[PDB]
Every structure is written in structure tokens, then in C-alpha cells.
Amino acid sequence: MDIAAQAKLVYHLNKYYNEKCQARKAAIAKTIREVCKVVSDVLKEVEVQEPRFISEGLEVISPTEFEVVLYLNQMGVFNVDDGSLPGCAVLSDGRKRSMSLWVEFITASGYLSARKIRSRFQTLVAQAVDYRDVVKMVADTSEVKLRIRDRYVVQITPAFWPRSAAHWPLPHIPWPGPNRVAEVKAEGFNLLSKECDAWVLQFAEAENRLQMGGCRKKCLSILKTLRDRHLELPGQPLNNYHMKTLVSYECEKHPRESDWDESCLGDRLNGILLQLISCLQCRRCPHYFLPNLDLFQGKPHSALENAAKQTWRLAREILTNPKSLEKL
């Protein structure tokens, strides 16, 4: 009897993925196509004032929030991760300051300033917005953020293998195979100009590729969707990034690709919600690549607890009656 309920769960989850998850990616695509015209148009204007800025590398934060990473024409004339500041990193010799496309922006100390490029970029964006009612500029934040049609918020973050991520993959876990490891590692990493004077690290390119195989993406698509529909809560305790970062952890716990067959979608999804409820209750949720930073950092105890209540309540309605997914 325990066999048939596993299959019923996998069936209704596939319906959720095809009915509700696809609808998400459809509404998001409508919202992104509307948003992306505004940004690329504005970015075209920034290109005429500053040609170094140019118009793929997108990030969905929520259905209404996005982060555009703008990959700048670089020279990489500058060569550095230390325990100094967690999750964030920062030239070689006192020569070749004139080698950078952004040569003016290297500091007197000889370091290259994220704070200064983002300000220069922010001044340009706030100026380009002056269009009437459809675009707004977000202030009191160091990062560039636009408010479009008073409905959506888009952050535009200037952007281009690390010391903390060096352990991964630990040869302990058969996953990933040497083929998947070197393949995902070739993606490299990205540095995002955000506050913490440092650059934020992001592996959205490696993370999303690491989860290739099996139902991992269907699981993420289902997790992101459930979060949108039922876990947008006071305190914004839960992000698409929380789900994304958990799916990777569950990949380790179940190393074998067989654990990720389509038959196992219910198990892996159920396993992930539970680990999430633990993270909420334990009050700690670590980054996949960098354990030193906790993605619950700064979250109120009241909100982390309530999120645990709703996440738990959600998994039970699912298991007791998996058809309940239709009405979710």
C-alpha cells in the first residue's frame, strides 16, 4: 500500500508541474518580457553615455523581483579570497593601471572598487529614467533598482574557482561524477556589485547547471512555485534561493542519480520540505558553496517560526491527500 501512495504523489506533482509550474514560468515570462524591454532600453541609453556598459544572466528573486546581472566587457588585468569578509571577495603589481577598460576605477590602494562602479552606474540609471509613470528609481539603497509600472521591482547589478568552494566536491560523495564536477566547475563563478566595500559572490551559473539531471529541476520548479503560492510570508523568510540552495544539498544526501529518477520525485520533494522545516526551526540555513554565510542571517525569530508552521502544514495536507495539490 505504501508503494501506491508513492506513485500517486508522483502523478499529482507532475500535474502540478505541468499545470501550475508552467503557469508560473508563463506569467513570469510575460512579466520578464515586459521588464526586460524597460531595462535593455534604459541600458541602451547607458551604452550611449557609457559604451563600456552593454546589454541571459538573469535571476528571478520572486515573481515580481528580478536581478539583472550585467556582464561587463572586462580585461581581467587584475588578479583573491580571504577569510576577512565571508562570502565576498575583492591588481597584481603597481603597474598597468592603464590596462583596465575601467582604469580610472582602480583605487589608490591599488584595489578595484565595487562601490565606485555601482555609484557611477546608479547615477547613469537614475538620469536615464527621466520614463514618466511606467519606470521608477529605487533610492536609499546603494544598488541600482527600478520600479516598473508600480508592480515589479528589478535590481540591475554590475557583474563580470573560489577558496571557500575549493572543498567541493568532496570525493566522499559519488555525486557528482568526475565528469559532472569538472563540467560544472568550468562554468566558473560571478562577482556581483552589492553591499555586504566588497563584491558579492554568486554561482547562479554553476548552481543551476549543477542540478542538471533527473527531476532536480522539476523539483526546483515545484519548490519555487509552492514558495510563491503558499510561502510568501511576513519577514520574507523564504526565497527562491532557499529552495535552489536546498535542492543542491538534497543532491548530495542522495548522491546516486538513481535517487533522482522520476520515480523518486515525491521522495526528494518530501525530503526537501522536511529539511527546510528543520532549517527554519534550527534557525540556520547555510549557503551551498560557502558555509560561513547563513541565508537566514537577519531573520526575525517570529517569522522563521511561522514559516515553519506553514511549511509543515503544507507538507501534511500534501501527504494525507495528494490530490490537494489541485487546489494548491
Author numbering: 0 to 54, 64 to 87, 89 to 99, 102 to 141, 145 to 174, 180 to 215, 228 to 359
Show me the paper's own sentences about this structure.
The male abnormal 21 (MAB21) like proteins form a sequence related subfamily within the large and diverse family of nucleotidyltransferase (NTase) fold proteins. Here, we provide the first crystal structure of a MAB21 protein and the structure of MAB21L1 bound to CTP.
We crystallized native MAB21L1 in space group C2 with unit cell constants a = 167.7 Å, b = 177.6 Å, c = 115.6 Å, β = 126.5°. The crystal packing of MAB21L1 is unusual and consists of an intimate assembly of ten copies of MAB12L1 into a decamer, formed from two back-to-back stacked pentameric rings. However, we were not able to identify by structural or mass spectrometric methods the nature of this low molecular weight ligand, which may be a buffer component or have co-purified with the protein from E. coli. The fact that the structure of MAB21L1 without any nucleotides added shows density for an unidentified molecule in the ligand binding pocket may support the suggestion that this positively-charged site acts as a binding site for an acidic ligand. Although the equivalent region of MAB21L1 is ordered in our crystal structure, it notably does not adopt the α-helical NB-loop conformation.
